[PDB]
């Protein structure tokens, strides 16, 4: 889960 | 689970 | 920009 | 922006 990675969001940027 | 990408986002960008 | 880099997801992994 | 790296993420992992």
Not at 1 to 4: E, G, L, M, S, Y
Request: charged share 0%; no cysteine.
């Amino acid at each position: 889960n990675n969001q940027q």
